[PDB]
Amino acid sequence: IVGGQEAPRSKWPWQVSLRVHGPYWMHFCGGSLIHPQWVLTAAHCVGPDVKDLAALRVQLREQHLYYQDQLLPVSRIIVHPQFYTAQIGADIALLELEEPVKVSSHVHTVTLPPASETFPPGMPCWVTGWGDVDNDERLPPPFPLKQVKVPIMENHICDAKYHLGAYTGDDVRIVRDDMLCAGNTRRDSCQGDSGGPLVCKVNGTWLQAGVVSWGEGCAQPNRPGIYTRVTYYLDWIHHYVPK
Amino acid sequence: IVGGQEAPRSKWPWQVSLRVHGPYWMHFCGGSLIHPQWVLTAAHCVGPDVKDLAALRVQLREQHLYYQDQLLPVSRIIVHPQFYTAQIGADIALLELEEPVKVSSHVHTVTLPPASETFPPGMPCWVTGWGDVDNDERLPPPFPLKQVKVPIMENHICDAKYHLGAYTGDDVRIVRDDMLCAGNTRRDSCQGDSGGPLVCKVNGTWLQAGVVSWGEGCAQPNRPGIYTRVTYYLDWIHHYVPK
Amino acid sequence: IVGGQEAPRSKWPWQVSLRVHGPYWMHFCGGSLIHPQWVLTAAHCVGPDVKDLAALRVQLREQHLYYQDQLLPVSRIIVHPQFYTAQIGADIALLELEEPVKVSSHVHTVTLPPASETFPPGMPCWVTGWGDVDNDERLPPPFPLKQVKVPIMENHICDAKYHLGAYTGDDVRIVRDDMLCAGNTRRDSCQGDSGGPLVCKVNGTWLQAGVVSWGEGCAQPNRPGIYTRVTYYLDWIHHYVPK
Amino acid sequence: IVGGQEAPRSKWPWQVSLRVHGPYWMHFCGGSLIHPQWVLTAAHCVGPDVKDLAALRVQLREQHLYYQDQLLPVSRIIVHPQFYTAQIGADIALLELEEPVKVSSHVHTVTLPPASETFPPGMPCWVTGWGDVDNDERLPPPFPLKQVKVPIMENHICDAKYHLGAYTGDDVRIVRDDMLCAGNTRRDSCQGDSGGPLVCKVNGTWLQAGVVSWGEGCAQPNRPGIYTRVTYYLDWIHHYVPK
Ligand SMILES: *C(=O)CCCC1CCNCC1
Ligand SMILES: *C(=O)CCCC1CCNCC1
Ligand SMILES: *C(=O)CCCC1CCNCC1
Ligand SMILES: *C(=O)CCCC1CCNCC1
C-alpha cells in the first residue's frame, strides 16, 4: 500500500493473506472473505497455470503478518476460464476453504455489490493489504496491514491516462470494460496487494468494488491502479458462491 | 539462445543489438536491419510507454558483445499502434537510425517475406541473439552471438499445448493468428533475445518469418516459443520502410 | 542459530538485539544485558570504525523480532582499544544505554564469570540469537529467538582443526587464547548471532562464557564456532561497568 | 581500479588474471608474472583454505578480459605459511605454471626490488587491474585493464590514518611492518584488483613494490590502499623463484 497507514484492528475484517509453501509460508497475494467458505482474489495470483493445492494456504485478518498465523487449507482453486493475463482481463478467482470460518465481529465477510451498483467516479474507496509501501520498497517488519483512501476514476478517463506517454493508438482500449480504476499519484495499491480488495461505503455498507489487478508502477502519474470490476463478474461468482 | 552454438562470423549479417544508456550501453534486446536506415524489433522492447531516444543506441552485427562497439543513435521509434502487451499481440516496432548504414557482405539487411509465405512445419528456421543460455542463466562473456535451429510448429498445435496445465478455457485463444511458434525442450530463444529475428531459408534466400516476442520460460515443455508473425504486419512496415 | 529450537519465553532474559537505522530499525547483531545500564556485545558489531550513535538502538528480550519493539537509545559505544578484526582478537565491546532499565523476572542481567572460571570441555553451554538457521538462509518470520546447546572443546583442539585443510603453518595460532570454541556440524551460531552470548550453567547460576565472534561458515566440519573469552576481558569490563 | 584509465596496450606486460572455474573461467584476482614460470599474488586470493588446482587457471596480459583467452594451468599453489588473514599479514602467494611462458616485449616478467630498495613516500607508482571502478561498481564490459598513479605513503602515516575515526588504540598496529600503502581519496585499487601488482619505475626500471592486499573501501578518506610489501618477503619468494 502506497501513501497509506497501518489499519486499526477493527477495520477490514475480511482482508485475507495467501501463503505459498517454501522455507516458510510466505505471503504472495491478498484476498477477501466474501462468504464463510469463499475467498475472492485475482486470477494472476493463482494462474493461469494450474497450481498445487497442498502448497496453498489462507490466513484471515492478521494485524501483523506471520505473527499470529493460523493457516487454513484450500479445497478448490477456481480461476475464470476467460483469464490468461491481467491486461487481457477476467483477472478473478475464487478459493474454497476446507471449512467455513466462524464469523465474528473482528473477522467476517465483505458484501458483494448489487449487479446495479455503479460506484461513481470521485467516490471515496479504500484498498488494503501487506504489499510494498512503494516501488521496490518492501513492507518493513512487523508487517502491519495497511490501508489508503483512493478515488475511483471513470474507465474512459483512466484508459485515456494510460495512453498519455504511450505508443498505443488512442482508439485501442487498454483499460477494458471488465476493469475498474482507482488511485492517484500519492495513493495506490502496490506489488503484494494483488488480489486484495477495493471497498467503498455506499448505503452505510461496505461493498467490494474491485480486486487489485495490475498497473504500471505504484502511484505513478497518469497510470492509476487497475482493478478487476466486481459487478461485471457477479454471475460467475454466483455460479459457486451461495447468495 | 538455449541450445545451439556460436554463430560463424559470416552468418546473420542483419543481427543487431539494442543498447540502453547506464553504467555502460548495455544490451537489452535484439533486432534486425531490414533497410540501411531501419531496424525491426519487438514493440515490448521499447514500449508501450515512450522512452527517451537519447538513452537508446543500436549496435550492428558484432561477433562478441561490447568488444567492437560502434553505437548508432536513433532518430525515431515507431511502435505498432495496436500494441500494449506481447500476449495481446502486435509485438512489433521500427527503429529509424539518424544516418543510413553502409552495407557489406558482413553486415547487410535481411529480406522480408512475401505476404503469402506461411513457413509450414518441417520448415528449416534459425533464431539468433545474445540472450540467456537457459532460464536464469546469462550468456557468459565474451558474449558470442549464438544461433539455434528451431522446429516450426502450426499455431493450432501450439495453442492447444499452451492450454495444457492451464486454467484457461480451451476456446480462449492464447497463441494468436498474428503470432508464430517455434522451438522445443532443447532449442529456443530466451530472455535477451527479444526483438531479434527468426529466419528461414526459402528457395535459397533467408526471409524473416518472425520476431522473438514471448513465452512462458525457455525451452519448457508444452510452452513453445512465440514470435510475432512478420507476414501479418507487412502493410504496416511498408507505411514506413521503402520497398 | 543452527540446529536449535525456539527458546521458551522464560529463558535468556538477558538477550538483546542491536538495531541499525534505515528503512526500519533492522537487527544486525545480538548482545547481552550485564547491568541495568550496560550491554555486552562483539566489537566487530560496532567497530573498529566509529559509527553515529544516533543510528543505533537496543531492543531488550523479545520472543519475536520487531513484534513488541521498544527501542532504547545509546549514549556510549566503548570498544576494546586492541580490537581491529575478530581473527586477531579482543572482539568485545560495551554499550551504555541513555537510561537505566528496569529489571524483572523476564528481563534482567546475565552474571559474568569469575576470572578463574575455565569452562571445561563437557560444559553444558547454550548460545542464543535471531541469526540465520544455516549458511545463507535467514531466520524466517515471525523471527523467534532461538537457542541451541553446543559442546565446548579445548582451545588447542579447535586450533588444530582450523589448520586442517589450510595452508596456515601448524605453529601459527589461529584460535587464540582470548577466545573460546564450541559447536559442531549440527549445532552452532551463525551470521546475525554475532555479539550474542554463550552461557553455561555453572553450579546453579548462569555465567556468560563468551561473545559470538567468528568462524568459517556455520556448523562446518573442522571449523567450530569461535567466541570471545569473557574471563580474559573481565578487568577491562570493570573499568566501565559497576558491581 | 578507482580514478584510473584504460591501460595502453604496451604497458603492464606482467599483469595476469586469475580464473576460477564455473559457468565460465571467471576472474577473481590479479597477479604478476615475476618469472617465466612464476606468478606472484595475494595469499587471501587462494587461501587460507586449500583449493583444488584443477579449478584454477591463469591468463596473461589481456587488453580486455575474456576476449582473447588462452588459459594456462597451474602446477602448484604456494601460500606463505604465516598467512591466515590479510589484516594479520603475510598476504602473499606464489603460483607455479605448468609451463614456462615464452616472453615477448608484449608479455614478460616484472622485476622484483632488491632487499635494499625503499620506495620513499611520494614515489611515482602505479597499480593496475580489472577490479571495480568504484565501491560496489563493477568494471563494465568489454572489461579493459585499468591503471592509476598512486602515491606511496610512509607506513606510520597510514597506520595513523587508519586510527582516525576508529576505536583501535593509537599504539596498536593496524598497518603492519610487512605491509605498504599507497593511494588517496581519488585513486586506489578496488575489489577485483587483489593480488595485483603495485609497480614503481626506479632509475628507468619498473620494480614491484607491493601486492594489492586489503583496505577499507576504495579511495576512502584516511583509509589508503594497503599492500603486502614485497621487499619484506624476497627471502621467502626466492626459496622457490630462482634469480
Ligand atoms: C499485484 O501485486 C501485482 C501488481 C499490482 C499493481 C501495483 C501498482 N498499483 C496497481 C496494482
Ligand atoms: C525477450 O527477451 C523476452 C523473452 C522471450 C521468450 C523466451 C522463451 N522463448 C520465447 C520468447
Ligand atoms: C556474526 O554474526 C558473524 C558470524 C559469527 C560466526 C557464525 C558461525 N559460528 C561461529 C560464529
Ligand atoms: C581485493 O580485491 C580485495 C580488496 C582490495 C582493497 C580495495 C580498496 N583499496 C585497497 C585494496
Side-chain angles (χ1 to χ4, degrees), chain A, chain B, chain C, chain D residues 1-170 172-243:
Chain A
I1 301 302
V2 178
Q5 73 204 307
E6 184 179 341
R9 292 191 171 62
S10 55
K11 298 196 75 172
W12 324 136
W14 48 74
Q15 185 74 218
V16 311
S17 171
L18 298 189
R19 305 304 181 67
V20 53
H21 182 285
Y24 67 100
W25 287 95
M26 190 171 56
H27 168 84
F28 65 97
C29 272
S32 66
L33 192 66
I34 62 166
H35 170 101
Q37 290 198 71
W38 298 82
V39 169
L40 183 63
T41 189
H44 77 263
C45 284
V46 300
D49 292 288
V50 313
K51 317 304 179 191
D52 184 350
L53 276 184
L56 180 60
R57 290 292 196 287
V58 170
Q59 172 56 53
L60 303 164
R61 193 196 195 299
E62 260 183 350
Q63 191 55 46
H64 300 93
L65 260 191
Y66 309 114
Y67 288 65
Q68 295 298 176
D69 274 23
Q70 221 59 298
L71 310 183
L72 307 168
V74 176
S75 61
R76 280 187 78 186
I77 290 182
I78 302 174
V79 175
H80 203 303
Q82 224 87 296
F83 178 76
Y84 191 60
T85 77
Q87 289 69 43
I88 296 164
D91 189 7
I92 189 170
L94 289 172
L95 300 189
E96 187 172 49
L97 309 172
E98 294 223 326
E99 301 283 348
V101 305
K102 307 298 189 178
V103 169
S104 73
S105 301
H106 185 64
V107 61
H108 69 287
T109 75
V110 63
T111 303
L112 260 18
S116 70
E117 199 53 47
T118 177
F119 300 119
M123 182 185 280
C125 299
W126 297 73
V127 66
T128 52
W130 296 274
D132 297 350
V133 293
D134 203 338
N135 288 143
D136 301 306
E137 200 161 300
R138 301 296 149 296
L139 178 62
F143 314 115
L145 175 66
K146 290 188 74 202
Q147 56 173 53
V148 62
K149 188 178 67 184
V150 303
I152 280 183
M153 294 193 72
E154 262 196 293
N155 255 213
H156 64 309
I157 283 299
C158 286
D159 180 71
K161 294 213 278 211
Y162 268 73
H163 287 74
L164 293 173
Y167 297 112
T168 325
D170 298 304
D171 53 303
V172 181
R173 191 146 286 179
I174 294 173
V175 178
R176 294 172 156 66
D177 291 292
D178 61 327
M179 290 166 208
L180 183 163
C181 181
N184 63 198
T185 65
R186 304 160 96 87
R187 297 128 174 299
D188 188 21
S189 40
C190 199
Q191 276 66 41
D193 293 316
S194 270
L198 174 55
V199 303
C200 318
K201 225 284 302 304
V202 192
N203 277 312
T205 303
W206 286 111
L207 307 173
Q208 208 189 312
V211 174
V212 182
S213 173
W214 64 283
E216 158 178 342
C218 307
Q220 294 320 302
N222 293 168
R223 298 288 184 279
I226 302 309
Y227 300 71
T228 296
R229 182 183 283 282
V230 178
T231 55
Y232 190 110
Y233 294 96
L234 286 188
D235 297 332
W236 176 79
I237 297 170
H238 288 154
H239 265 165
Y240 306 105
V241 176
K243 302 146 51 184
Chain B
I1 296 297
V2 192
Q5 45 171 182
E6 187 179 329
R9 32 172 51 76
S10 68
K11 260 60 170 297
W12 327 128
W14 52 69
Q15 175 65 242
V16 314
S17 165
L18 305 189
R19 308 296 188 67
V20 64
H21 178 77
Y24 61 101
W25 290 92
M26 179 176 56
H27 165 92
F28 67 93
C29 272
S32 58
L33 190 77
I34 57 167
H35 173 286
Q37 206 160 189
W38 299 85
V39 171
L40 174 63
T41 187
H44 83 257
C45 282
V46 288
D49 306 284
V50 169
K51 337 290 189 198
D52 180 354
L53 284 59
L56 172 68
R57 293 267 210 289
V58 174
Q59 172 52 49
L60 298 176
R61 222 273 183 189
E62 247 190 1
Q63 189 58 34
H64 290 99
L65 270 183
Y66 311 115
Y67 286 87
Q68 295 298 299
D69 288 0
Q70 307 198 83
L71 306 194
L72 309 179
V74 176
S75 60
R76 299 187 63 193
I77 297 176
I78 306 177
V79 178
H80 195 99
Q82 291 253 278
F83 174 69
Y84 198 70
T85 78
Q87 289 69 49
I88 298 184
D91 194 5
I92 191 166
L94 288 167
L95 300 179
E96 170 155 51
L97 305 178
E98 292 184 10
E99 309 292 347
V101 318
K102 305 295 174 175
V103 305
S104 64
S105 74
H106 187 71
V107 295
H108 56 262
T109 68
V110 69
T111 310
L112 293 188
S116 313
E117 189 62 56
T118 58
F119 303 109
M123 265 279 280
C125 306
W126 303 68
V127 64
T128 55
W130 289 281
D132 300 352
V133 294
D134 211 357
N135 298 292
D136 283 342
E137 207 162 293
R138 280 58 233 179
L139 173 71
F143 319 111
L145 177 63
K146 295 233 298 172
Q147 56 174 45
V148 67
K149 179 191 174 179
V150 285
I152 292 292
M153 340 203 297
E154 182 185 300
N155 280 48
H156 180 56
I157 298 307
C158 286
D159 188 46
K161 276 204 174 101
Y162 266 71
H163 285 80
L164 293 182
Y167 293 123
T168 310
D170 293 6
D171 290 338
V172 177
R173 240 99 161 316
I174 296 170
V175 175
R176 322 222 169 179
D177 311 336
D178 75 320
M179 297 171 197
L180 182 164
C181 66
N184 61 203
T185 47
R186 306 180 320 283
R187 311 166 181 298
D188 183 23
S189 58
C190 202
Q191 280 60 40
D193 286 325
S194 279
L198 172 59
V199 298
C200 317
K201 203 174 183 183
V202 180
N203 294 158
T205 77
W206 294 96
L207 303 173
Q208 202 182 319
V211 184
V212 180
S213 180
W214 63 286
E216 180 194 299
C218 307
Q220 288 306 317
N222 292 326
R223 298 297 184 271
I226 307 297
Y227 302 69
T228 302
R229 187 174 289 279
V230 180
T231 48
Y232 196 105
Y233 292 101
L234 290 171
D235 282 345
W236 180 76
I237 297 180
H238 296 311
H239 181 272
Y240 297 102
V241 182
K243 333 303 193 67
Chain C
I1 299 291
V2 170
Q5 46 186 51
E6 192 182 321
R9 187 171 289 275
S10 65
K11 295 292 207 321
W12 329 123
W14 51 69
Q15 183 67 227
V16 153
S17 170
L18 265 42
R19 308 296 182 68
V20 59
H21 184 76
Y24 64 108
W25 290 97
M26 182 174 53
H27 163 106
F28 60 100
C29 269
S32 63
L33 191 69
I34 59 172
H35 177 90
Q37 272 196 281
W38 299 85
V39 175
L40 173 72
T41 198
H44 81 257
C45 286
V46 293
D49 303 291
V50 178
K51 331 295 183 203
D52 178 339
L53 283 69
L56 171 70
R57 300 294 179 65
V58 179
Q59 170 56 47
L60 301 168
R61 183 69 164 64
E62 242 180 356
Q63 261 304 303
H64 300 86
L65 276 185
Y66 313 115
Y67 193 13
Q68 309 296 175
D69 272 25
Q70 290 185 301
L71 313 188
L72 298 174
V74 158
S75 68
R76 268 157 73 189
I77 295 178
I78 305 174
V79 176
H80 198 287
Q82 289 180 179
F83 169 83
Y84 194 70
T85 82
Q87 287 62 46
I88 303 182
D91 182 24
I92 190 168
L94 290 169
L95 301 179
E96 179 166 43
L97 305 172
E98 275 175 38
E99 304 291 343
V101 302
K102 301 300 163 61
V103 305
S104 61
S105 174
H106 194 288
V107 170
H108 59 271
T109 66
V110 62
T111 307
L112 299 186
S116 59
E117 186 63 25
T118 298
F119 308 88
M123 269 282 97
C125 309
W126 298 69
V127 64
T128 49
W130 294 275
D132 305 345
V133 295
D134 213 324
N135 295 292
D136 294 56
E137 43 190 66
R138 320 307 140 182
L139 175 68
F143 318 113
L145 172 70
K146 297 224 304 170
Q147 56 179 47
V148 66
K149 172 187 289 186
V150 291
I152 286 201
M153 297 148 77
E154 161 193 302
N155 270 46
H156 200 299
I157 246 302
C158 289
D159 186 60
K161 278 172 164 292
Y162 267 72
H163 283 84
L164 293 186
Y167 296 105
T168 305
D170 286 350
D171 283 307
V172 181
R173 283 296 200 61
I174 294 176
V175 179
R176 314 211 163 184
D177 315 321
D178 69 306
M179 296 170 194
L180 182 294
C181 67
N184 52 41
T185 55
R186 289 167 292 260
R187 307 163 179 295
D188 189 22
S189 45
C190 204
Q191 278 62 46
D193 292 318
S194 277
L198 173 59
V199 299
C200 321
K201 209 178 187 187
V202 178
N203 176 49
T205 60
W206 290 98
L207 303 172
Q208 196 178 330
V211 177
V212 175
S213 187
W214 63 285
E216 174 187 327
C218 310
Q220 294 294 66
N222 279 169
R223 300 297 187 271
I226 304 301
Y227 303 70
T228 305
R229 186 174 291 275
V230 184
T231 47
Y232 198 103
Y233 295 102
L234 233 34
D235 283 330
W236 179 74
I237 299 170
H238 298 311
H239 176 289
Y240 300 99
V241 193
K243 259 266 48 63
Chain D
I1 299 297
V2 189
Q5 223 88 67
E6 186 176 330
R9 311 179 95 292
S10 59
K11 291 203 193 304
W12 327 134
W14 45 75
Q15 181 75 221
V16 310
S17 172
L18 301 188
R19 306 306 182 71
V20 58
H21 177 67
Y24 64 93
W25 288 94
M26 183 169 53
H27 169 83
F28 65 98
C29 269
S32 55
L33 181 75
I34 58 172
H35 182 90
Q37 202 164 355
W38 295 86
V39 173
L40 180 67
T41 192
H44 85 252
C45 284
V46 295
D49 296 313
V50 173
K51 311 295 172 56
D52 193 304
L53 272 186
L56 181 61
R57 293 281 193 292
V58 49
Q59 167 63 53
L60 287 7
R61 194 187 193 299
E62 238 183 1
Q63 189 58 50
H64 298 99
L65 266 187
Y66 307 117
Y67 189 42
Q68 303 295 54
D69 272 27
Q70 304 201 299
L71 302 180
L72 311 176
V74 174
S75 59
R76 179 183 176 193
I77 302 293
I78 306 179
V79 180
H80 203 299
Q82 315 287 214
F83 176 76
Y84 188 59
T85 80
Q87 290 77 38
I88 289 165
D91 191 9
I92 187 177
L94 287 172
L95 263 49
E96 187 182 36
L97 313 178
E98 299 202 5
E99 216 70 283
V101 177
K102 267 51 190 297
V103 304
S104 70
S105 64
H106 180 62
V107 171
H108 69 281
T109 82
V110 62
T111 292
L112 288 177
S116 48
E117 187 49 49
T118 179
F119 305 120
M123 169 67 86
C125 306
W126 299 71
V127 62
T128 54
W130 299 279
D132 293 359
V133 296
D134 210 306
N135 287 300
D136 189 74
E137 195 167 308
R138 320 314 163 200
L139 178 60
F143 313 112
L145 171 70
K146 289 191 61 189
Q147 66 178 44
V148 61
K149 182 206 295 78
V150 296
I152 279 190
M153 293 197 268
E154 266 197 60
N155 262 214
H156 74 312
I157 286 299
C158 286
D159 184 56
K161 278 179 182 160
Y162 272 72
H163 283 74
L164 298 180
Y167 298 111
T168 311
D170 294 334
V172 177
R173 286 298 239 303
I174 299 174
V175 185
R176 305 183 166 187
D177 292 301
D178 67 328
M179 291 164 201
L180 175 169
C181 61
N184 54 23
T185 63
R186 308 187 314 297
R187 323 173 185 305
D188 181 29
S189 52
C190 206
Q191 281 61 38
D193 291 307
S194 277
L198 208 200
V199 293
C200 315
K201 190 162 58 65
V202 188
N203 261 315
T205 304
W206 294 97
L207 309 187
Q208 206 192 316
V211 179
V212 178
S213 180
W214 64 286
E216 188 181 295
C218 313
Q220 309 299 78
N222 292 172
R223 300 291 190 274
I226 308 299
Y227 301 70
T228 304
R229 177 187 294 287
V230 177
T231 55
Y232 194 106
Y233 293 101
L234 290 188
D235 288 355
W236 179 76
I237 290 171
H238 288 153
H239 267 32
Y240 305 95
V241 178
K243 330 306 179 64

